[PDB]
Design an enzyme around this catalytic site. Sequence first.
Site, PDB file in Angstrom:
ATOM      1  N   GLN A   3     -24.128 -20.844  10.345  1.00  0.00           N
ATOM      2  CA  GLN A   3     -23.697 -20.356  11.898  1.00  0.00           C
ATOM      3  C   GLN A   3     -23.995 -19.616  13.081  1.00  0.00           C
ATOM      4  O   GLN A   3     -23.765 -19.884  14.510  1.00  0.00           O
ATOM      5  CB  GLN A   3     -21.738 -20.048  11.922  1.00  0.00           C
ATOM      6  CG  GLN A   3     -20.745 -20.634  10.797  1.00  0.00           C
ATOM      7  CD  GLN A   3     -19.570 -19.806  10.556  1.00  0.00           C
ATOM      8  OE1 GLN A   3     -19.087 -18.955  10.331  1.00  0.00           O
ATOM      9  NE2 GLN A   3     -19.147 -20.383   9.377  1.00  0.00           N
ATOM     10  N   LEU A   4     -24.048 -18.437  12.561  1.00  0.00           N
ATOM     11  CA  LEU A   4     -25.391 -17.381  13.159  1.00  0.00           C
ATOM     12  C   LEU A   4     -26.193 -18.255  14.199  1.00  0.00           C
ATOM     13  O   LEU A   4     -26.347 -17.793  15.453  1.00  0.00           O
ATOM     14  CB  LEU A   4     -25.730 -16.625  12.165  1.00  0.00           C
ATOM     15  CG  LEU A   4     -26.624 -15.815  13.012  1.00  0.00           C
ATOM     16  CD1 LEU A   4     -25.525 -15.277  14.875  1.00  0.00           C
ATOM     17  CD2 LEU A   4     -27.178 -14.384  12.798  1.00  0.00           C
ATOM     18  N   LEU A  51     -11.342 -19.750  16.472  1.00  0.00           N
ATOM     19  CA  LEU A  51     -10.374 -20.515  16.947  1.00  0.00           C
ATOM     20  C   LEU A  51     -10.722 -21.293  17.876  1.00  0.00           C
ATOM     21  O   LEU A  51     -10.562 -22.722  17.714  1.00  0.00           O
ATOM     22  CB  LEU A  51      -8.981 -20.606  17.493  1.00  0.00           C
ATOM     23  CG  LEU A  51      -7.929 -21.206  17.202  1.00  0.00           C
ATOM     24  CD1 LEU A  51      -7.318 -20.543  15.808  1.00  0.00           C
ATOM     25  CD2 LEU A  51      -6.396 -20.840  18.434  1.00  0.00           C
ATOM     26  N   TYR A  81     -15.690  -2.061   6.522  1.00  0.00           N
ATOM     27  CA  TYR A  81     -15.581  -3.237   6.711  1.00  0.00           C
ATOM     28  C   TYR A  81     -16.332  -3.249   4.920  1.00  0.00           C
ATOM     29  O   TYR A  81     -17.117  -2.443   4.750  1.00  0.00           O
ATOM     30  CB  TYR A  81     -17.353  -4.026   7.474  1.00  0.00           C
ATOM     31  CG  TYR A  81     -16.640  -3.882   8.646  1.00  0.00           C
ATOM     32  CD1 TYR A  81     -15.281  -4.031   9.169  1.00  0.00           C
ATOM     33  CD2 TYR A  81     -17.547  -4.174   9.873  1.00  0.00           C
ATOM     34  CE1 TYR A  81     -15.057  -4.193  10.487  1.00  0.00           C
ATOM     35  CE2 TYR A  81     -16.975  -4.032  11.443  1.00  0.00           C
ATOM     36  CZ  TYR A  81     -16.030  -4.259  11.536  1.00  0.00           C
ATOM     37  OH  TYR A  81     -15.802  -4.172  12.703  1.00  0.00           O
ATOM     38  N   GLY A 113     -13.214 -25.343  17.373  1.00  0.00           N
ATOM     39  CA  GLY A 113     -12.726 -26.519  17.486  1.00  0.00           C
ATOM     40  C   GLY A 113     -12.402 -27.372  16.082  1.00  0.00           C
ATOM     41  O   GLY A 113     -11.650 -28.096  15.840  1.00  0.00           O
TER      42      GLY A 113
HETATM   43  N1  LIG Z   1     -13.629  -3.987  16.873  1.00  0.00           N
HETATM   44  C1  LIG Z   1     -12.758  -4.266  16.407  1.00  0.00           C
HETATM   45  O1  LIG Z   1     -11.414  -4.105  16.349  1.00  0.00           O
HETATM   46  C2  LIG Z   1     -12.963  -6.016  15.994  1.00  0.00           C
HETATM   47  C3  LIG Z   1     -12.380  -6.508  15.841  1.00  0.00           C
HETATM   48  C4  LIG Z   1     -13.197  -8.260  14.887  1.00  0.00           C
HETATM   49  C5  LIG Z   1     -14.321  -8.018  15.339  1.00  0.00           C
HETATM   50  N2  LIG Z   1     -15.781  -6.864  15.520  1.00  0.00           N
HETATM   51  C6  LIG Z   1     -16.856  -6.650  15.893  1.00  0.00           C
HETATM   52  O2  LIG Z   1     -17.226  -7.778  16.263  1.00  0.00           O
HETATM   53  C7  LIG Z   1     -18.323  -8.828  15.624  1.00  0.00           C
HETATM   54  C8  LIG Z   1     -18.002 -10.228  15.821  1.00  0.00           C
HETATM   55  O3  LIG Z   1     -16.106 -10.976  15.600  1.00  0.00           O
HETATM   56  P1  LIG Z   1     -15.577 -11.521  15.434  1.00  0.00           P
HETATM   57  O4  LIG Z   1     -16.123 -12.121  13.696  1.00  0.00           O
HETATM   58  O5  LIG Z   1     -14.782 -11.549  15.627  1.00  0.00           O
HETATM   59  O6  LIG Z   1     -16.084 -13.457  16.461  1.00  0.00           O
HETATM   60  P2  LIG Z   1     -16.104 -14.509  16.729  1.00  0.00           P
HETATM   61  O7  LIG Z   1     -17.180 -15.555  16.517  1.00  0.00           O
HETATM   62  O8  LIG Z   1     -14.788 -14.631  17.063  1.00  0.00           O
HETATM   63  O9  LIG Z   1     -15.763 -15.167  14.311  1.00  0.00           O
HETATM   64  C9  LIG Z   1     -16.686 -15.144  14.178  1.00  0.00           C
HETATM   65  C10 LIG Z   1     -15.794 -16.320  12.974  1.00  0.00           C
HETATM   66  O10 LIG Z   1     -15.622 -17.405  13.279  1.00  0.00           O
HETATM   67  C11 LIG Z   1     -16.051 -18.601  12.766  1.00  0.00           C
HETATM   68  N3  LIG Z   1     -17.457 -18.628  12.810  1.00  0.00           N
HETATM   69  C12 LIG Z   1     -18.456 -18.454  13.916  1.00  0.00           C
HETATM   70  N4  LIG Z   1     -19.049 -19.633  14.014  1.00  0.00           N
HETATM   71  C13 LIG Z   1     -19.066 -20.275  13.783  1.00  0.00           C
HETATM   72  C14 LIG Z   1     -19.711 -21.593  13.675  1.00  0.00           C
HETATM   73  N5  LIG Z   1     -20.427 -21.603  14.364  1.00  0.00           N
HETATM   74  N6  LIG Z   1     -19.156 -23.057  13.139  1.00  0.00           N
HETATM   75  C15 LIG Z   1     -18.281 -22.401  13.052  1.00  0.00           C
HETATM   76  N7  LIG Z   1     -16.969 -21.237  12.391  1.00  0.00           N
HETATM   77  C16 LIG Z   1     -17.786 -20.331  13.110  1.00  0.00           C
HETATM   78  C17 LIG Z   1     -16.226 -17.406  11.268  1.00  0.00           C
HETATM   79  O11 LIG Z   1     -14.881 -17.651  10.386  1.00  0.00           O
HETATM   80  P3  LIG Z   1     -14.781 -18.402   9.026  1.00  0.00           P
HETATM   81  O12 LIG Z   1     -15.969 -18.932   8.333  1.00  0.00           O
HETATM   82  O13 LIG Z   1     -14.379 -17.644   8.785  1.00  0.00           O
HETATM   83  O14 LIG Z   1     -14.021 -19.928   9.393  1.00  0.00           O
HETATM   84  C18 LIG Z   1     -16.563 -16.504  11.681  1.00  0.00           C
HETATM   85  O15 LIG Z   1     -15.986 -15.421  10.882  1.00  0.00           O
HETATM   86  C19 LIG Z   1     -17.396  -8.685  13.461  1.00  0.00           C
HETATM   87  O16 LIG Z   1     -19.070  -9.047  12.597  1.00  0.00           O
HETATM   88  C20 LIG Z   1     -17.168  -6.826  13.824  1.00  0.00           C
HETATM   89  O17 LIG Z   1     -18.408  -6.728  14.026  1.00  0.00           O
HETATM   90  C21 LIG Z   1     -14.817  -5.524  15.931  1.00  0.00           C
END
Ligand SMILES: NC(=O)c1ccc[n+]([C@@H]2O[C@H](COP(=O)([O-])OP(=O)(O)OC[C@H]3O[C@@H](n4cnc5c(N)ncnc54)[C@H](OP(=O)(O)O)[C@@H]3O)[C@@H](O)[C@H]2O)c1
Length: 325
Positions: free
Chosen positions: A288-289, A198, A43, A201
């Site tokens: 967001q968090l 995604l 990362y 929404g």
């Molecule tokens: N093992 C692996 O291969 C792998 C793969 C993926 C992730 N991970 C780990 O898992 C964690 C989480 O996965 P993820 O980031 O994919 O989770 P996720 O919740 O599916 O995606 C998060 C993304 O969604 C958007 N988002 C989140 N909350 C939002 C809100 N309240 N309102 C509007 N947009 C929002 C943001 O994107 P934008 O603002 O960029 O649009 C954020 O970067 C990562 O940080 C990482 O540590 C591991």
Amino acid sequence: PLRPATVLGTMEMGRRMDASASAASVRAFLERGHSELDTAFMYCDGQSENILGGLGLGLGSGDCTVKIATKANPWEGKSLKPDSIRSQLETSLKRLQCPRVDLFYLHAPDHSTPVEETLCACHQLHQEGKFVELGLSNYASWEVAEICTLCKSNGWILPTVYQGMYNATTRQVEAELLPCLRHFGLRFYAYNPLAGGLLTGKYKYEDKDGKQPVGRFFGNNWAETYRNRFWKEHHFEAIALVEKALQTTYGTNAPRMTSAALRWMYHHSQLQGTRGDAVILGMSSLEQLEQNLAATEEGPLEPAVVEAFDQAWNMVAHECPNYFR
Ligand SMILES: NC(=O)c1ccc[n+]([C@@H]2O[C@H](COP(=O)([O-])OP(=O)(O)OC[C@H]3O[C@@H](n4cnc5c(N)ncnc54)[C@H](OP(=O)(O)O)[C@@H]3O)[C@@H](O)[C@H]2O)c1
């Protein structure tokens, strides 16, 4: 049961989130009573680890509440050969300013390196005290079974955690992986709980041709990979189905799609908190968090909405992305 645990994802620390936003986020996360963080060697070219190491959390110094996970990956020529694994982990420890991690993953399979070689190396590093638990990510159930079976017979540390792709509309892991992990005693941590955003929404399908709004799905080197994973017309339809159910069921009190999607995970998924299963939250901002943290504390959804989430999966199931690589 108890609800699944909550793990903080750190993939955006060093990209959209600076050190100060990152600190604020961790602080917010710890204040809610949570304790695990998820990063990776990969990362932000090491900035996510570097940022976390500077937060003064005393990671890996048992005497220590906060738990850290990192990961070694085979990409860009690195492989999961013994020397590579060792170098990645030792680099991560330096960046995290810590003598050992609580959880070390194989981030994705290296199909060019015999897995026994990689496992033997993992066992050696564990013996040196460099990590407490081993995990796997993005291996197929059957590959997990091979690895656990090999470790048993060779006296190597078994992996105890699997980190996998799981959300209301992405459920491939249910059929085979979950039964495999239950058999071999691994807990499961879900990534992409919001399908990379995604499931907020916030998008429309045709954003791919028009707006191309900067974020997870546009502008960065994994964007195309993300779009191939999730950016499908039936997925949009499926989300709209759920939004309509939320409006019909709750009216003006309707939760946001984001908060519905997360509540699915904590209440209506196959994650079991009694087994130590967890959701890894994602964010590219503090704001967001905080939204996401609040959602995790909300209760079950109404039956009609849970049904709509099932219908939504039924629409996309035939084109679900592979949890394994
Ligand atoms: N093992 C692996 O291969 C792998 C793969 C993926 C992730 N991970 C780990 O898992 C964690 C989480 O996965 P993820 O980031 O994919 O989770 P996720 O919740 O599916 O995606 C998060 C993304 O969604 C958007 N988002 C989140 N909350 C939002 C809100 N309240 N309102 C509007 N947009 C929002 C943001 O994107 P934008 O603002 O960029 O649009 C954020 O970067 C990562 O940080 C990482 O540590 C591991």
